[PDB]
Amino acid sequence: SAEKHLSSVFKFNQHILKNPLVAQGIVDKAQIRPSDVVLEVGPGTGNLTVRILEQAKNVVAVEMDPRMAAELTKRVRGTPVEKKLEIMLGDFMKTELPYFDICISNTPYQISSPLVFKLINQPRPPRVSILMFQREF
Amino acid sequence: SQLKNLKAALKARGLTGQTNVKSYDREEKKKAIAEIREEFNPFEAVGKPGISKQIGEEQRKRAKRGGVIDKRF
Amino acid sequence: KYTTFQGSQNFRLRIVLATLSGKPIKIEKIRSGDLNPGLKDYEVSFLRLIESVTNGSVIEISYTGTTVIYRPGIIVGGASTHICPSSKPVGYFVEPMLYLAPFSKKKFSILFKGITASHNDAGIEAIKWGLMPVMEKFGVRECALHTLKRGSPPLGGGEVHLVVDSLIAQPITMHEIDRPIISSITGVAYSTRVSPSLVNRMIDGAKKVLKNLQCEVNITADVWRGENSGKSPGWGITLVAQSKQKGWSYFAEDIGDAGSIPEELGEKVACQLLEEISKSAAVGRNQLPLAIVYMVIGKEDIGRLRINKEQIDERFIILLRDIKKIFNTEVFLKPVDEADNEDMIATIKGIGFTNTSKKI
Amino acid sequence: KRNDVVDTLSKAKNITVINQKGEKKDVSGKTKKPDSTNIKL
Amino acid sequence: FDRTAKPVPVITSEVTESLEDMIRRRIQDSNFDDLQRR
Amino acid sequence: FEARQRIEEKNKESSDYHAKMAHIVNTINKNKYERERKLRGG
Amino acid sequence: LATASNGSLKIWNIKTHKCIRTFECGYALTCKFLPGGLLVILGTRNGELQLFDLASSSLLDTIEDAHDAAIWSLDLTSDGKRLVTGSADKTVKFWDFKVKLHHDTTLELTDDILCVRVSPDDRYLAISLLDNTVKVFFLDSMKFYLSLYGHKLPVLSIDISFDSKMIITSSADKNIKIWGLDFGDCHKSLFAHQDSIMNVKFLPQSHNFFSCSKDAVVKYWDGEKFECIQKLYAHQSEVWALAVATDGGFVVSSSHDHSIRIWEET
Amino acid sequence: WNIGKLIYMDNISPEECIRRWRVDLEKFVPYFDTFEKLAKKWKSVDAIKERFL
């Protein structure tokens, strides 16, 4: 009955960065501290998320596509960072976001602008927030 | 043969089989790992004398101006 | 013959200044009346360290150990490894080695192993942020003490790798007749094999004393763990007052022993630095012996260094006295024209020393 | 291979699912969920 | 004096532990270079 | 035994030599202490 | 031997094995023995402090307002004048006994005090809190010295060594961690009991220790070995409380099904 | 008692020099006063504001 529920929530029916160096720098610009925690959005391959994991005690990632979470689970399978990592499946606008000190996110531009205002209005907001985003807006 | 003796040694020290069986400390396992490794490599059953040349070589590996003339007792 | 001196007082200084001069030295009556007379292990080990980096030297310890005859060779250097005995840390051996490194045939790439901190010896950070910066001022552009592993007392187990890539003919002439303005205070609070709260509590003690100041206070919270955290747990703090105008620094350091409160030590090292600043004009007391020697071995020109009255103590006097017998150089002092403070300008001339050991 | 995806979601433990209505549920389909009295007593 | 050819190696222990380590890692990963039916 | 030691010595001397040549031809045409941060964690 | 339960205290002479006297009380959580042994403390879940006399055969005076919430854990100084209580309200209350019991000072704390353990030398005091860190205070100075860290779950019991250089802690995470005083450093952590260890006891003048856990097991370890000498399975149901003689000879353990058994070295 | 001369009269000991006009390097940490005396001395950040910006 588990798989049928997984079908019920999500039908199971994106642009990817080639340059890790810029993504590496975005972690460097975030300047997360070990005593601090991170919430992640739109992990995808999550090579950015791994760089968070080595630095942050606790990493909570939310992936929109169930399949992208799976390939993440496979890649991080059998690693110490996996246990600290938390993967969240599905749209996090509805769910009350757990507290996180800093934001790193490859958020889709379609849903981005509501998420910022939720992030701004999220009680006890982060001191620092970094989001991957379109230029014009 | 050597397999039967070996699989028996592992099982006696608890290195094989299910651990959640229903109805030895880890540190002692590593000592068992050390003890089994040396026992079952006869080249390093026991080999004839002279098959190995380790003692010759180790002796070999063991084998500036002005001096600190130390005449202290 | 041999310039003849008494006791273990300033033992290394009299070996290194002998090394810098090339003038052979005799030091006699080393703890003659003590139950255990003659040289102790660490200062025997130091003579071995000198022999490793010098070439052609002759060292003779007496039958009772109470007399040493030292005929210096040329400073050659090279890559080597030194085992520091558990009695003293690596800091005891690296500082006198800093006196010699820039003036060698080959670069100094030496690995020091043993305890890395004590209550009486220089820590890594004291060498790192406290004495090494003075060398940047003296013209030693490239010089580094890489920390691979720490060893806290009593068991130690630490490793530090000293590299002095800058080889220069002689130190640049000193000209500092002003009391440098401190721009900010930085430092490192360190711990081994113990919870990170100890470092944070150590910083908590430090900020409490110093928050009254109008400065930015940024003390690094740095915690060793794992294979590289030594074989004993321990912790210490090093606070540095830093002057970005002319690149000057003043530092205080101490380590915490058994039963001590990390806040209490953080308070100590914090008010300790402030006491050092009040007693300092251009360099701290822990940097003054470092600064004066390089000027004595500079070019044949008068250089000016400003010193406070509190700096000219017995330590400054015997140290000056030691220099004269080896070099015949006298340090003159003239009062500053100011009336706000009573500081003194110590005028010294370099002996025209040159790095002749280098390949040209 | 969607069937190989869903099981991988179920095998790992640190996963929480998001339906349409507003709460958090696990892969199996049940709502995913110290106290001073319990820990000692 | 110079030697013309490579010296024949000596199988000291440290070589022995290094070799058997690689054997164990191959089997731990089941990374076996063996022929298969085609 | 000395044959093996000589080969190792010559390989080391040659390898150091090419590195030294590479540096000069590279030269002709910040923080020294990052590594402490990694070793610090263990 | 004193055995404290809900609604009653029962004291049993070991030689007779028969109850000398039974004292009515509340849901007594911790039972401590006054100085000189004429008297016994209990700490109720209601929080009211309980004061017994072996001689008078009953409770003297119940300080209803002695504590706001349950006095979960309670302990006694070596001299025994000063009494300390660890409890739910997140405030530690100190008491001094006089020929009446008076409260000297209250210590504010961020988190509730699950277990309070006093050193025999009385120079420091370990505080067990739900926040999974144990803060140790100097009793002579009254100031904070070190904080234990790395317990996955709050510590259930704290022990003090005879040299007092070793702090033995057993946690709901089921791992018993032994702390070096000299710098607050772990020599070893041991997952001894498959369930959590409610009470661990330190052998007198010996670095050994005993443990008791909900899994009904009792294990005998040595520090310098860091290994278990003997494992004891005699408890049908979970063993709540473990105790060790002042002599050190016989080790009292009480099961949930009311079985009282005491372990003697040969 | 100009210290310039007193430094170079070797017959006068350095300790004896210091007192008129007013111990070993192997201890790198220099001499200091007790904590409480320093703590009272540095209750305020006065006497040093000139050294800081």
> DSSP string covering C116-170, please?
---SSS--HHIIIIIIHHHHHHHT--S-EEEEEE---TTT--EEEEEEE----SS
The C residues from 187 to 226 touching F (CB cutoff 8 Å) are: 222-226
Asked if C156 and C185 sit in the same domain, the reply is no
Examine residue C56 and state whether it is found in any structural domain, yes or no.
yes
Contact B66 C59 (CB under 8 A): yes
Neighbors of chain E with 3 or more C-beta pairs under 8 Å: B, F
Question: Which contiguous run of DSSP H or E holds residue C199?
Answer: helix C197-210
Provide the residue type at G160 as one letter: I
Contact C314 H42 (CB under 8 A): no
Contact D34 G88 (CB under 8 A): no
Is it the case that chain C and chain D have 3 or more CB pairs lying under 8 Å apart?
no
What are the tokens at F35? 């590594």
Identify whether the C-beta of residue C254 lies closer than 8 Å to the C-beta of residue C269.
yes
> Which residue in this structure is represented by tokens 């000189």?
G36
Among candidate residues C230, C251, C274, the one where a domain is terminated:
C274
Is it the case that chain B and chain E have 3 or more CB pairs lying under 8 Å apart?
yes
Residue of B54, B55, B58 best to disrupt the E interface, most CBs of E under 10 A? B54
Q: Which residue among A83, A86, A90 places its CB closest to the CB of D17?
A: A90
User: What is the DSSP code (8-state) at residue C101?
Assistant: G
β C78-83/C54-55 pair status = unpaired
User: What is the DSSP code (8-state) at residue D31?
Assistant: B
Q: Which residue among A2, A85, A91 places its CB closest to the CB of D27?
A: A2
A15 is in an annotated binding site: yes
Asked if C210 and C279 sit in the same domain, the reply is no
Task: Report the sign of the C-alpha dihedral through residues C271, C273, C277, C280, in that order.
Answer: positive
Task: Report the sign of the C-alpha dihedral through residues G165, C90, C26, C62, in that order.
Answer: positive
User: Could you tell me the strand order of the sheet in which G91-97 lies?
Assistant: G73-76, G82-86, G91-97, G101-108
Asked if C122 and C262 sit in the same domain, the reply is no
G145 to chain C, any CB pair closer than 8 A? The answer is yes
- What residue of C is the nearest CA neighbor of F32? C144
Phi, psi of C108 (to 5 degrees): -90, 115
Task: Report the sign of the C-alpha dihedral through residues C36, C37, C40, C45, in that order.
Answer: negative
Rg value, chain G, Cα: 18
β A102-105/A38-41 pair status = parallel
Asked if C206 and C241 sit in the same domain, the reply is yes
Asked if C129 and C196 sit in the same domain, the reply is no
Length of chain F: 42
β G250-255/G260-264 pair status = antiparallel
> Which residue in this structure is represented by tokens 């540190």?
B27
Question: Which contiguous run of DSSP H or E holds residue H5?
Answer: helix H3-8
Question: Cα separations (Å) of G120 from A118, G19, G139, G169, G204?
Answer: 56, 29, 11, 16, 11
Contact F42 C222 (CB under 8 A): no
Residues 6+ apart with CB under 8 A from C34: none
> Which residue in this structure is represented by tokens 């969607």?
D2
G180 to chain C, any CB pair closer than 8 A? The answer is yes
Contact D34 G172 (CB under 8 A): yes
Q: Can you spell out the DSSP letters for A63-116?
A: ESSHHHHHHHHHHTTT-HHHHHEEEEES-TTTSPPPP-SEEEE---HHHHHHHH
Residues of chain E contacting B41 with CB distance shorter than 8 Å = 16
Partners of G241 in beta bridges: G254
Reduce the DSSP state of residue A11 to 3 states and report it.
coil
Provide the residue type at H22 as one letter: R
If phi > 0 it is left, if psi is from -120 to 50 it is alpha, else beta; for residue C186 that is beta
| C-alpha B17 chain-centroid distance | 24
The CA distance from D30 to the nearest CA of chain G, in Å, is 26
Question: Cα separations (Å) of A10 from A61, A64, A90, A93, D7?
Answer: 18, 10, 8, 16, 15
Residues of chain D contacting G114 with CB distance shorter than 8 Å = 36, 39-40
Neighbors of chain H with 3 or more C-beta pairs under 8 Å: C
What is the signed CA dihedral for G142, G143, G147, G148, rounded to 10 degrees?
-20
The CA distance from E16 to the nearest CA of chain B, in Å, is 9
- Rounded-to-integer distance, Cα C121 and Cα H27, Å: 6
Partners of G28 in beta bridges: G44
Question: Cα separations (Å) of G150 from B33, C193, H53?
Answer: 30, 13, 43
A42 is in an annotated binding site: yes
Residues of chain F contacting C229 with CB distance shorter than 8 Å = 42
If phi > 0 it is left, if psi is from -120 to 50 it is alpha, else beta; for residue E28 that is alpha
H36 to chain C, any CB pair closer than 8 A? The answer is no
Examine residue C159 and state whether it is found in any structural domain, yes or no.
yes
Angle, CA C218 vertex, CA C214 and CA C220 arms, to 5°: 160
Asked if C147 and C211 sit in the same domain, the reply is no
Length of chain E: 38
Omega before A126 cis (within 30°)? Answer: no
Asked if C136 and C205 sit in the same domain, the reply is no
Contact H25 C12 (CB under 8 A): yes
The CA distance from H31 to the nearest CA of chain C, in Å, is 9
- What residue of F is the nearest CA neighbor of E4? F3
Asked if C298 and C268 sit in the same domain, the reply is no
Identify whether the C-beta of residue H8 lies closer than 8 Å to the C-beta of residue C251.
no
The interaxial angle of helices C262-278 and C197-210, nearest 10 deg, is 40
Examine residue C195 and state whether it is found in any structural domain, yes or no.
yes
How many Cβ atoms sit within 10 Å of the Cβ of residue B7? 12
- What residue of D is the nearest CA neighbor of G157? D40
Asked if C256 and C217 sit in the same domain, the reply is yes
Q: Which residue among A2, A66, A90 places its CB closest to the CB of D28?
A: A2
Among candidate residues C243, C274, C305, the one where a domain is terminated:
C274
Among candidate residues C212, C239, C274, the one where a domain is terminated:
C274
Identify whether the C-beta of residue C145 lies closer than 8 Å to the C-beta of residue C132.
yes
Provide the residue type at D34 as one letter: P
Identify whether the C-beta of residue G116 lies closer than 8 Å to the C-beta of residue G75.
yes
Per the structure, the complete domain to which residue C165 belongs is given by: 1-177+275-355
Examine residue C311 and state whether it is found in any structural domain, yes or no.
yes
Length of chain H: 53
Rg value, chain E, Cα: 17
Please choose, from the candidates G114, G117, G94, the residue with its C-alpha nearest in 3D space to the C-alpha of residue G106.
Answer: G94
Identify whether the C-beta of residue C230 lies closer than 8 Å to the C-beta of residue C150.
yes
- Rounded-to-integer distance, Cα F34 and Cα C147, Å: 11
Residues of chain B contacting E10 with CB distance shorter than 8 Å = 53, 57
A91 is in an annotated binding site: yes
Contact F7 E3 (CB under 8 A): yes
Residues of chain G contacting C235 with CB distance shorter than 8 Å = 183
Longest dimension (CA), chain B: 75
Please choose, from the candidates G119, G157, G155, G156, the residue with its C-alpha nearest in 3D space to the C-alpha of residue G138.
Answer: G119
User: What is the DSSP code (8-state) at residue E7?
Assistant: P
User: What is the DSSP code (8-state) at residue B21?
Assistant: -
Contact B57 E10 (CB under 8 A): yes
Q: Which long-range contacts (CB under 8 A, 24 or more apart) does A18-27 make?
A: A20/A47, A23/A47, A23/A48, A23/A51, A24/A51, A26/A104, A26/A130, A26/A132, A27/A51, A27/A52, A27/A55, A27/A104
What are the tokens at C177? 């007749």
Task: Report the sign of the C-alpha dihedral through residues C12, C13, C17, C20, in that order.
Answer: positive
A87 to chain D, any CB pair closer than 8 A? The answer is yes
Q: What is the resolution of this structure in A?
A: 6.0
Asked if C265 and C152 sit in the same domain, the reply is no
- Rounded-to-integer distance, Cα H3 and Cα C317, Å: 10
Solved with:
cryo-EM
Q: Can you spell out the DSSP letters for C208-264?
A: HHHTTSSS-EEEEEEEE-GGGS-SS-EEEEEEEEEETTTTEEEEEEEEE-TT--HHH
- Rounded-to-integer distance, Cα H50 and Cα H53, Å: 7
- Rounded-to-integer distance, Cα C63 and Cα A36, Å: 62
* 3-state per-residue secondary structure call for chain G: CEEEEECEEEEECCCCCCEEEEECCCEEEEEEECHHHCEEEEEECCCCEEEEECCCCEECCCECCCCCCCCCEEEECCCCCEEEEECCCCEEEEEEECCCEEEEEEEECCCCEEEEEECCCCCEEEEEECCCCEEEEECCCCCEEEEECCCCCCEEEEEECCCCCEEEEEECCCCEEEEECCCCEEEEEECCCCCCEEEEEECCCCCCEEEEECCCCEEEEECCCCEEEEEECCCCCCEEEEEECCCCCEEEEEECCCCEEEEECC
> Residues of chain B whose C-beta is under 8 A from some C-beta in E?
41, 44, 52-54, 57-58
> What count of Cα atoms within 13 Å lies in the side-chain half-sphere of residue F2?
3
Asked if C171 and C280 sit in the same domain, the reply is yes
* CATH label of the domain that carries residue C206: 3.30.360.20
Provide the residue type at A56 as one letter: A
- Rounded-to-integer distance, Cα A104 and Cα A85, Å: 14
B-C interface: how many C-beta pairs under 8 angstroms? Answer: 38
Neighbors of chain D with 3 or more C-beta pairs under 8 Å: A, G
Residues of chain B contacting E11 with CB distance shorter than 8 Å = 52-54
Contact D29 A2 (CB under 8 A): yes
- Rounded-to-integer distance, Cα D17 and Cα A54, Å: 25
| C-alpha C181 chain-centroid distance | 23
Examine residue C360 and state whether it is found in any structural domain, yes or no.
no
- Rounded-to-integer distance, Cα C217 and Cα B51, Å: 68
| Percent helix, percent strand, percent coil in chain B, to nearest 5 | 45, 5, 50
| C-alpha C250 chain-centroid distance | 13
β G250-255/G227-232 pair status = unpaired
The CA distance from D24 to the nearest CA of chain A, in Å, is 8
Contact F35 C146 (CB under 8 A): yes
What are the tokens at G160? 């003090």
What is the signed CA dihedral for A116, A122, A125, A130, rounded to 10 degrees?
-20
Identify whether the C-beta of residue G144 lies closer than 8 Å to the C-beta of residue G101.
no
Give the count of domains, chain C: 2
Give the residue before each break in chain F, using a C-to-N cut-off of over 2.5 angstroms; say none if it is continuous: 29
Residues of chain C contacting B66 with CB distance shorter than 8 Å = 51, 54-59, 73
Please choose, from the candidates A134, A94, A99, the residue with its C-alpha nearest in 3D space to the C-alpha of residue A113.
Answer: A134
Residue D10 burial by Cβ neighbours in a 10 Å radius (0-12, 13-18, 19+): middle
Residues 6+ apart with CB under 8 A from F17: none
- Rounded-to-integer distance, Cα C191 and Cα G185, Å: 11
Task: Report the sign of the C-alpha dihedral through residues C68, C73, C75, C81, in that order.
Answer: negative
Contact H28 C286 (CB under 8 A): yes
Contact C258 G182 (CB under 8 A): yes
User: What is the DSSP code (8-state) at residue C102?
Assistant: G
Provide the residue type at C64 as one letter: T
Residue C338 burial by Cβ neighbours in a 10 Å radius (0-12, 13-18, 19+): exposed
- Rounded-to-integer distance, Cα C247 and Cα C315, Å: 25
Q: Can you spell out the DSSP letters for C266-333?
A: HHHHHHHHHHHHHT-SSS-TTTHHHHHHHHHTS-SSEEEEEE-GGG-SHHHHHHHHHHHHHH----EE
* CATH label of the domain that carries residue C136: 3.65.10.20
> Residues of chain D whose C-beta is under 8 A from some C-beta in G?
34, 36, 39-40
What is the signed CA dihedral for G209, G213, G216, G219, rounded to 10 degrees?
-20
Question: Cα separations (Å) of G241 from A87, C297, D40, G35?
Answer: 42, 76, 11, 21
- Rounded-to-integer distance, Cα G89 and Cα C208, Å: 30
G149 to chain C, any CB pair closer than 8 A? The answer is yes
A40 is in an annotated binding site: no
Examine residue C193 and state whether it is found in any structural domain, yes or no.
yes
β C54-55/C25-28 pair status = unpaired
Reduce the DSSP state of residue C93 to 3 states and report it.
helix
The CA distance from B73 to the nearest CA of chain C, in Å, is 6
Asked if C183 and C156 sit in the same domain, the reply is no
Identify whether the C-beta of residue A14 lies closer than 8 Å to the C-beta of residue A108.
yes
Intra-chain end-to-end CA distance of chain H, in Å: 36
